[PDB]
Amino acid sequence: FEGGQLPLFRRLPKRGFTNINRKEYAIVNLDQLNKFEDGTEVTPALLVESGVVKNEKSGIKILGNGSLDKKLTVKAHKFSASAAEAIDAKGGAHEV
């Protein structure tokens, strides 16, 4: 309340909407993938069990922050272009 001056949150306008079908992904970066032994088959179940991912949300997306230092076969619902490139370049493989 501002003593009768039109309050801020009435002088400013509303914006936007919320998407009913909004999707959000549990994200995993390459630096986090670095904990699995080279040759590992990283899957959503393995990520959850290992505790890298707690809440899977709409699925696992791999992102490219940090450096991958291991060869892995990564199964996830989505990949950043950079994440897929790093996984392949380290000799590993990725699949959606």
């Binding site: 501002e2 801020l8 949150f9 009435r10 002088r11 400013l12 306008p13 509303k14 914006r15």
Partner: protein, 64 residues
């Protein structure tokens, strides 16, 4: 009981990474013939909630 979010403010702001509140701009509804091209162009750009306003309103958006 739980505190209640101020729903109008929630419809008018978004919280940024450092905890600030992104806001849209007043004077963007009508009467555009009375505001210069430059005025309207720049009113198109979002701002933040000022520090002095934040002191007053922060509890309204604690859950936001």
């Amino acid at each position: 009981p739980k505190m209640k979010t101020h729903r109008g403010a929630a419809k008018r702001v978004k919280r940024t990474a450092s905890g600030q509140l992104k806001r849209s701009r007043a004077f963007t509804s009508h009467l555009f013939a009375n505001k210069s091209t430059k005025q309207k162009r720049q009113l198109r750009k979002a701002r933040l909630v000022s520090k002095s306003d934040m002191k007053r309103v922060k509890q309204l958006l604690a859950y936001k």
